[PDB]
Amino acid sequence: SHYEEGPGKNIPFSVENKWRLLAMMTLFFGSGFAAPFFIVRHQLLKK
Amino acid sequence: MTHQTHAYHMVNPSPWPLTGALSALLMTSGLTMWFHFNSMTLLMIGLTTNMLTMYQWWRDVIRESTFQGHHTPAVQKGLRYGMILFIISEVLFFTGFFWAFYHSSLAPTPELGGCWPPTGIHPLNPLEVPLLNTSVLLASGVSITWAHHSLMEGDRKHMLQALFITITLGVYFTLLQASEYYEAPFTISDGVYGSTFFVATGFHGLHVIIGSTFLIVCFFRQLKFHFTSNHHFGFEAGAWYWHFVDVVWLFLYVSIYWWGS
Amino acid sequence: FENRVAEKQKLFQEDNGLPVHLKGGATDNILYRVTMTLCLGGTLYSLYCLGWASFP
Amino acid sequence: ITAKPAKTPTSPKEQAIGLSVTFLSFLLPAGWVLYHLDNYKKS
Amino acid sequence: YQTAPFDSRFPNQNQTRNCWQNYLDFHRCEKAMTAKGGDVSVCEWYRRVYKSLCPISWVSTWDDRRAEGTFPGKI
Amino acid sequence: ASGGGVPTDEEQATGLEREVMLAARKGQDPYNILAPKATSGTKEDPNLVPSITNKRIVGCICEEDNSTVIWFWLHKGEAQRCPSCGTHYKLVPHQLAH
Amino acid sequence: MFINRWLFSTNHKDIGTLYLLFGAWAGMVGTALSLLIRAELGQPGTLLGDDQIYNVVVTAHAFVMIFFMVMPIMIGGFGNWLVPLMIGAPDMAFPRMNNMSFWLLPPSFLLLLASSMVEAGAGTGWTVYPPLAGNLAHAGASVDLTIFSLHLAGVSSILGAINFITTIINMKPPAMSQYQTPLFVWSVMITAVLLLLSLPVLAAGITMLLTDRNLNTTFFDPAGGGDPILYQHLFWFFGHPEVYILILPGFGMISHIVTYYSGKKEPFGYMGMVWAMMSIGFLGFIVWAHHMFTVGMDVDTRAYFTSATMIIAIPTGVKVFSWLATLHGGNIKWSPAMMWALGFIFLFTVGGLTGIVLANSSLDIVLHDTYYVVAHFHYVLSMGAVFAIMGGFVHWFPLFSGYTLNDTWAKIHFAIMFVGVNMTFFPQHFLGLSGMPRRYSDYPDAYTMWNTISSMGSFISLTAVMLMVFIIWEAFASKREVLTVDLTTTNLEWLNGCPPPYHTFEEPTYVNLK
Amino acid sequence: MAYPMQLGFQDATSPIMEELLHFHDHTLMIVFLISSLVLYIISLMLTTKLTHTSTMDAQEVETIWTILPAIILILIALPSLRILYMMDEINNPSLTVKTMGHQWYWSYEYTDYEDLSFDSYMIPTSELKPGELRLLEVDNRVVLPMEMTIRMLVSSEDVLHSWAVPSLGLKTDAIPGRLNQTTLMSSRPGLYYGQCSEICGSNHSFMPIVLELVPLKYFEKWSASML
Amino acid sequence: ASAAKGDHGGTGARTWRFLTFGLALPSVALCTLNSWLHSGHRERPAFIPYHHLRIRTKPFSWGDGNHTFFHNPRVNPLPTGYEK
Amino acid sequence: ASAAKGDHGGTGARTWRFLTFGLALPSVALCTLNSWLHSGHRERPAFIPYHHLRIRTKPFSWGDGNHTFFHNPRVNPLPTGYEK
């Protein structure tokens, strides 16, 4: 079994660079929060 | 650690839960196109990936059990609980349907004519074919029982024989019921009477088909010497599900076919 | 009838480092690759649909 | 709970950047969408 | 006659059957007298009541049904 | 006598199933299916915790009632004692694994 | 590799993580929907449009928070992660099936999203009752997509419930009785049983509504002789247990958090704590109808349902009092999680008390379908279920990750979130006594102040969640690996270090038979 | 109706809505006791340096925190049950109006004798005459004889609705195919407003209920003039 | 009715095979003769356009969307009237 | 109603002792309070000399042979009329 172990190896995303993570994390929760807004926009832009 | 000292099973990664999850999407959104943007392509793809997934998932399950020797005592005791539990959840599913029925028949709206069965509905005769189907399923219950006893007594020929008789009575019920569906003078669209009769008997009908193919699978695993006199859970589970399937029919029979008509 | 289960056992117990769903042979792989493909494509198709059906 | 010191400590400057980026990523998109509501209802 | 009085047989919040019972009752009592003359008698009470309790829509559609012969009630 | 042809486990059980099956008849339990019965746990009569390695987690139900189990690693070497009740535990090498 | 580990898994740990991940994301979504709701009500008038686009938002809020955030996080996350570790199991009973329980969530979530994309979406309330939910009032692919999302999400959970019950019952150390397993495990085993019985009934209820709007059946259409009420029963039969299915696990984690920071070995009255849960589990099945007080039911049966609903106050009572007794002689550590625990204890109380007022059908006649009930459930969900989730998260984060959180940052977050919620929901108690109805995109001018204060509150909460994201980032940014953990003698999940190795208990624990 | 900055219930216009105000005081008195008892015990537990982490005995005390709440519930259940039956009590109405929810308006039907029936829509904020309540105003008030026992039969012609009028302590879901009963009975003439208490579509928020209660005499003329 | 067929309706494969061919199957035979010794045919019910029947709130996603899945022309009338 | 009190309602004396005092008895307690929280008294039913009641085809072999075994004077009238 080639499964790495320990802090930062038991997660599906890289935790090596604090800044690349800041980006990944930001897109992740970011997109989550924005989606509802764009859905509402979508509905509003229809007829 | 490394060499495990517990009698439990650590299953190797399988891509089946993902394809199976994906299959649920395909079929559900597939049913949506059909119901609405009138089309069955997606649903066809869904039903396919689904059959493919189930075939391979149980295939592995047999591989791991019959060939690889992974089903220790501790392992099977847990498959019992799982099946037992799974059947209970089915028993609660049919409960919604019986509930709906008793709700509708116990207090008929004036729209029905303030009576049950509603005016215009012509119920089938419980004494005709509904009795035949009752006797058929019951007989399979005794023959499946003869099958399980032959198995635990190492009698290959007879297990295979009682299992065959069982499987055929089960198919005989499917056909018999299919024709009643055709000959029957009411439909899913005839208000509550039809609604209530066709989905309960219908979901049950889908269960006899699901239960029969299960038995058919057991039939083949047996020709292939898969089961030993003492290790044959696939058959124990098959028999449990089959008995569940009679009992639901015994309840539909007394409620919907007799009392409710 | 047969009873060549023992043969099947030896085969699946063979330490070839393969995972059980591939341990069986070449067809296991074609089946695998087929199933995986229809699922993905299907997913894409439905994505296309649920979107084409998202507008008036 | 006891722990080794940070293998890669985050200085206050960094922390401010990070706290900033986080808040923006939550506030801009929604802000834009909400800012143009009228424009949408007017079509 | 102010309005339909309390009816112990229909004592609960759900009055639906009270409207229905009387509407049937009236029309059945009518048909009866009709198929008998009865010095030319008339059972008005059932009408005044079902009149008070049944919403207009119910009665309108019930009659329409009785006219077209699609009324599922037994009269 | 006289049967019909279905395989017996004694002749068709394979893998771990067979392994635990045989060990069973020999009275051993290399796969921890049963509960280790205790000893007096004195310094001279400790409980012997087998192990396929140099350490093993021991759970101690100090008193029969106890809803709470006391856990701790038992390492290879001098007999150790449950933090809540003394009770001796001495590691021992595991057996019929493989 | 990545594919095999993260998509082809059979590891309770890896699966539990994937859940929490899905749970965090979904949480973000529900948070926004919750914020639109208040943005629409923070000032008299209409911001978005008619009750349709508004109520589409409301429904999407309810579904995302219940089925996509709370359930996955508490049961799939903390449930998958800790259960096998607390009882010393190598993994779950059905590893492969377990993986499917996760992979059914995203599809289910997509369907739910797509429902609001197509047509006008499902402005139906989370109770999705008919006629409104029917093919006339809500003609189109929306409601149907909502129903398919629910079916999948249900399949997932019952499949999960089968694994938990089998595991918890069949994979404990041979000498350990069920009366020796940790309260969290009992909490997840009881919750598993509740889902196993209630979910099938919902699936039968919504399958009926589906045939009613697609295959011409009339289960709930008077036209065919149907009953719009029959649906309410079926749904609520599952609906009440669901609220208890949402709190029991929280009840568990709280028992664990409170005991641990009091420095106690075990919690006060363990078996009473076990009885208490079992009872709540049982009574929660025979009280559904308190959700149908203004429907037209017989007074006698309306009496039964208020009496039965009140007896639940008793077992819940022994729980609240047992946790206070646990704190008792304690050597208290004012940790972030202990703050979340104490918060839960009081806030959940006020909220479950406010729910005793509602048990009275007489009095429920004028409180029903108003903002008073919005207050009630926001207290037990927003500052009960969610407060447990946070304590448990900041408590077990090191175990999952191997890294520690910044305790001060962790406390600021609490301080903020506390004010936010209490502000947001406290005034709603008045809005409801004073008559403001539920599911309104606008209100009579009189209701202006409280809705204005409440929405302001909703903004503070937003800040607290943005802050929580940063807090997690910093944690992974700095990398303060753990060194020591207290009380492990009585806390097995901490015995293999943080994080525990891919394969724990490869060699069983040793437990004597006294 | 409700005034700005309201805390509790709107003033009771009928005897049961009064009766409930008191039952709620009773109940709310108790939730205050318990919720303050709990906040005290909590702060107490957290306010000492003295420890005792060894085992502690349960149940001997658990009898207390089990028998007590049972008593308190009896103290709420009784009054509550009393009012409940009293509401669903044997009364003899001298009038029967019906009302029917429709997708975004209520139609009323008085039909004991003549067949008086009209609609009732909310007055658009635009068409409001200075002083009129912004979203509560309806074009046609349901006129009723003050101080009289009236029987209301609520229903609908489409989706579910719920006819509610707080000041009188009434709410009855409007269900198609069902005739729900409710006894209304004011003791004060005036204008008592209400709103549709059941989600039902785009204008779920815009279909109010207004009761104009005048003495019998004015009711009779109103009716005739109403046709 | 009741039941008391003397002895053996329990344990032993021979006993179960016995009930299978000795009881179970003869039953299905009786019931089959019975169900066919009455297998005539009902006269198609007189058509009356009742509103609570032949319900159609939405067209079936198959055929002319007005014919039920197991539509049997002889005994099942459309909403308008019998097939022919 | 239904039932789903989580876990343990099977094997192990401790578990059965648990249901005894944890479920069984509290029920008897509720039902006992209940049955007495309604333990008032019915008004003796108005007497009407119906023929299918107060039947006497032969005198009871005890007392004046006209009084039933558990004759309760208040709520049980003789054939002639109430006791007093």
Ligand code: HEA
């Ligand atoms: C988190 C889940 C949750 C929890 C835990 C609760 C707990 C309870 N809730 Fe529920 N409630 C909801 C969430 C849940 N609820 C939701 C989501 C809805 C609305 C959904 C919708 O319709 O859209 C709702 C709606 C709702 C209704 C319907 C009102 C209406 O719409 O007309 C009712 C009424 O009976 C009710 C009551 C209760 C009761 C009696 C409890 C009891 O569990 C509370 C018990 C707790 C205590 C009482 C405190 C602890 C005990 C003590 C301190 C001892 C002293 C106690 C006494 C002597 C009183 N709630």
Ligand code: HEA
């Ligand atoms: C779990 C359930 C839940 C929760 C937590 C909340 C939280 C929120 N709810 Fe909602 N709400 C309901 C479920 C919930 N709600 C339901 C069932 C309805 C009824 C729908 C109907 O009528 O049909 C509803 C109704 C409802 C209404 C009334 C709508 C109406 O009837 O007109 C309003 C308006 O004020 C509202 C407000 C809010 C707000 C501002 C939040 C805010 O407090 C949210 C703030 C954010 C959080 C507290 C969550 C943050 C936590 C996380 C995201 C976890 C992060 C993860 C990790 C730590 C790993 N909710």
Ligand SMILES: [Cu+2]
């Ligand atoms: Cu409830």
Ligand SMILES: [Cu+2]
């Ligand atoms: Cu309405």
Ligand SMILES: [Cu+2]
């Ligand atoms: Cu409404």
Ligand SMILES: [Mg+2]
């Ligand atoms: Mg309502």
Ligand code: NA
């Ligand atoms: Na608004």
Ligand SMILES: [Zn+2]
């Ligand atoms: Zn010990």
